[PDB]
């Protein structure tokens, strides 16, 4: 899979795999697995996780 | 976890 786009300015952009919308600097979180980057919402995460924890998207949890 | 959030 590829979420991030080079875009014309010559930055990164990361793209929500749940939405495919970018990140638009609302809360994000990041896969401690794929190292894909999704929107709080789209995966159901609701409050900041204690700093300590590991964070897996719904695609690596499974593996 | 890794978070990150921009106003
Ligand atoms: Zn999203
Ligand atoms: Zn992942």
Redesign the interface.
Known sequence: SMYVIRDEWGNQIWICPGCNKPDDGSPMIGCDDCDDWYHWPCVGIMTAPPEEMQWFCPKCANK | ?7
């Open positions: 976890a890794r978070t990150k959030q921009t106003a």
